[PDB]
Design a protein around this ligand. Structure first.
Ligand SMILES: O=C(O)c1ccccc1Nc1ccccc1C(=O)O
Ligand SMILES: O=C(O)c1ccccc1Nc1ccccc1C(=O)O
Lengths: 336, 334
């Protein structure tokens, strides 16, 4: 293959042949692509409209280059909780809540960011595979820092900053978690691509809820209904989801969006401390979603699973388990 | 204005606001663009489908920055003869024939200019000597790097990505001598109409030509699509050389791109060798002469018939051959 062949096919608005998206990503990840070529591909692959096959090839190449976690250190039922983007405030909190409920959580992220909010809370985010594994076992949660696990990605990273608008590369985060969890609640800000992401997870037979707030949030919203793509047994299933059916009062968006890392950390402490309000509700809702996805690994029933998910997430906060888990996560990083 | 605003608008499949393409190109030429931004912009505008307004803004900024020719040195009726690429042999020969017919020609090009160098022509002259060449010889060649230095970053990015983009239109659109007429070839059927719109807006008299076999010149193997530009309007036409008694040729008969080879092909044609290459040269030269005629008035058929007689006579009288010799002599004597 070649750049002119691949870019020419993309500018002609044609889907790529099998292996072409992979070849391209591999050039990018082996330092063999000029910034102009990386940018050209990023843009053309966005404007053509990427397929699940193509996105899966890109994620596949990244994971084939990534540092893995040591063998048998990631439980087969670990989950991820994340949005493509922020609702880092929400996903950070929901992840802690889910871990506290007893579902192993391994996240993947970077500073902008998922990572910023965590280190603001005193968590050590930049850990190698060995210690992420130990964190998962000892604390029940781990965080894989993208530069540490995908160092070959640095050339693409710099180019994304330079062009500064979202591309197909914005989709790859939840799809390139180096711990490779098989379940998750995965938010997508662009509804066009949510269905594509769901297809990618379906191909690897994950149990995920790919979620899109019909108000545009990359998380389950309480502002409006949400679209859920329920991925289980290699199958996708598009549903509309109303948290009103679980008693959630309607909030308005400006109450829910993330802010900077220091502000995110403050809201985390408030919620985990027991503050009620729309932020808590959104956390409980998204945490339950990850639990429902976790349940889908050994698939039972939709409403019962949600009702259980909600009880578990609520109790994890209310008993103080979530708050304690965060405290223990911090102690872990200091004692390591 | 900002790069993320402009690139986001393009990736959203939206036409730019007035001034935005201009701003982008000005950033590119004032050193304030990263290779990645330049590439993203060229690709995004291509996939969005560029408008004549947009491409015009791009060309406008380039020409606003370019080294001009000295005042009153370019005749009001000067013409260009050139294609986008995607027929340097054909356009080089046609330009010589047109100049020898008495229509001032000022070309704009770059090396990959090589074929002319092989013929002994001096390609890298500054504004004053191109002006002198045009007056003394009847033809001048503007070396693109010399007249568009601030464009070097963009030109490099174009090569790095390889795929054709809207940037492939900018060369023929930014002749620094600004001739008002021309035969302009475009290898990309989807961009040729946009390119014609740009020439129309600047009130040029141009034939934008696209061979229906993919050539960026008037072809002899089959029909060509011509966007006829005059009086600020564009008329789309299909052109068939058979209507003027030209036999069909095959694309291979027209082939070659080496320097010594193409120099040899120029000498053979200007020396009177007959066949498909001469026919194609005569066709494209007549087209340039038709565009030249369009500056003042207009009848398409008489114009072509006169263009064809003039092109043929310029070769047959030896005037074209002598003009090249005089061009070579000019550069050697400075
Ligand atoms: O910055 C990122 O988002 C990033 C993500 C994945 C891998 C590398 C990354 N960045 C870097 C890491 C080491 C040195 C330079 C860079 C750089 O930004 O140029
Ligand atoms: O071709 C070069 O290497 C070059 C070098 C320095 C300045 C400009 C250059 N090229 C151009 C000039 C005008 C219009 C289009 C181009 C182009 O090549 O796309």
């Amino acid at each position: 293959p070649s750049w002119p062949q691949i870019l020419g096919r993309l500018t002609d608005n044609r889907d790529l042949a099998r292996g072409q998206a992979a070849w391209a990503m591999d050039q990018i990840m082996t330092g063999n692509a000029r910034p102009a070529q990386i940018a050209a591909f990023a843009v053309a692959m966005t404007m053509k409209a990427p397929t699940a096959d193509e996105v899966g090839e890109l994620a596949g190449v990244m994971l084939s280059h990534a540092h893995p976690l040591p063998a048998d250190t990631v439980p087969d039922d670990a989950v991820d909780v994340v949005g493509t983007g922020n609702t880092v405030n929400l996903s950070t909190m929901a992840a802690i809540v889910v871990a506290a409920a007893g579902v192993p959580v391994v996240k993947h992220g970077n500073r902008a960011g998922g990572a910023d909010t965590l280190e603001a809370l005193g968590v050590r985010i930049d850990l190698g595979p060995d210690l992420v594994a130990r964190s998962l076992a000892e604390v029940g949660i781990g965080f894989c820092f993208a530069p540490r696990f995908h160092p070959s990605y640095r050339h693409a990273a710099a180019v994304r900053r330079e062009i500064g608008v979202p591309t197909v590369f914005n989709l790859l985060g939840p799809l390139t978690n180096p711990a490779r969890p098989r379940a998750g609640l995965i938010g997508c800000a662009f509804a066009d691509l949510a269905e594509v992401m769901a297809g990618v997870f379906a191909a690897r037979r994950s149990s995920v809820l790919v979620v899109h707030g019909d108000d545009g949030l990359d998380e389950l919203t309480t502002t409006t209904t949400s679209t859920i793509w329920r991925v289980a047994a290699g199958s996708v299933d598009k549903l509309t989801f109303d948290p009103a059916g679980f008693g959630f009062a309607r909030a308005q968006l400006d109450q829910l969006a993330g802010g900077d890392a220091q502000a995110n950390a403050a809201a985390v402490r408030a919620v985990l401390g027991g503050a009620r309000g729309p932020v808590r509700d959104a956390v409980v809702l998204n945490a339950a979603g990850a639990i429902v996805a976790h349940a889908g690994l050994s698939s039972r029933e939709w409403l019962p699973a949600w009702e259980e998910g909600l009880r578990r997430a609520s109790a994890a906060i209310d008993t103080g388990a979530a708050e304690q888990l965060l405290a223990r996560w911090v102690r872990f990083g200091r004692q390591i």
